[PDB]
Every structure is written in structure tokens, then in C-alpha cells.
């Protein structure tokens, strides 16, 4: 009995230890799936933004060309310097009025934004 009492205590204690440890491990995994979906969202937000801002700068330009406006007119030139500061910020300013626009959330990342998966563990 005593030895068996003691074997039981230790086998139960290690049952606990084994089980907390695995759970702690599934908890860490979930922290990573989560923190991972949050960055994918941040990225898709940036790209979503930059897309809309660059579209703005291109309509200013396509309008000037149709002559519908003149980016020299102080009011419209302000608008233009507005989009230019959004791009110049969230993009690589080349220097000659060309901007290198990087797109942070790829098709894989964008998919997660749809998938909605989190192997949510239940102990």
C-alpha cells in the first residue's frame, strides 16, 4: 500500500505536469496564430490604404490630362500635395516624382483574412 500510495501520488503528479505542459504549448501556439492574424490585418490595412491613396494621385493626374483641372491651381495643388504625402510616407519616394509602392499583404496573408481559422484548443 504505502509504496502503491506513493506510486499513485507520483503518477498523478506527472499526469498534471504532462498535461499543464501540453496545454501551455497549445496556448503558445494560439498566441502565435492570433498575433499572426493581427499582423496580416495590419498589412492588409496598409495595402488597402495605399491603394486608395495612390488611386487619388492618379485621378488628379488623369483629370489634369483631360484638362478637367490644373494642378497648378493652389486649391487642387494642395489636394495633390496631400496624396503625395500619403505616398511619400507609406512608399519609397524615388525622387523624380515616381514612387515605389510596396505591397505588404500577399495572397497567402490575404487568405487568412478570409479563412478565419484558429485551432482554438479546449483542455
Amino acid at each position: 500500500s504505502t509504496q502503491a500510495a506513493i506510486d499513485q501520488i507520483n503518477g498523478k503528479l506527472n499526469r498534471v505536469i504532462e498535461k499543464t505542459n501540453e496545454k501551455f504549448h497549445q496556448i503558445e501556439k494560439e498566441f502565435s496564430e492570433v498575433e499572426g492574424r493581427i499582423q496580416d490585418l495590419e498589412k492588409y490595412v496598409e495595402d488597402t490604404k495605399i491603394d486608395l491613396w495612390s488611386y487619388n494621385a492618379e485621378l488628379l493626374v488623369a483629370l489634369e490630362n483631360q484638362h478637367t483641372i490644373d494642378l497648378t491651381d493652389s486649391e487642387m495643388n494642395k489636394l495633390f500635395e496631400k496624396t503625395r504625402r500619403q505616398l511619400r510616407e507609406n512608399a519609397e519616394e524615388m525622387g523624380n516624382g515616381c514612387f515605389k509602392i510596396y505591397h505588404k499583404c500577399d495572397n497567402a496573408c490575404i487568405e487568412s483574412i478570409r479563412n478565419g481559422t484558429y485551432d482554438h484548443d479546449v483542455y
Binding site: 495612390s54 495643388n77 495633390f80 505616398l87 523624380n96 516624382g97 515605389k100 509602392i101 510596396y102 505591397h103
Partner: peptide, 8 residues
Amino acid sequence: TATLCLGH
């Protein structure tokens, strides 16, 4: 990535 030009 893409380059976008429009300069004054």
C-alpha cells in the same frame, strides 16, 4: 510592388 510616377 510597383512604381507610380506623377511629377510636377
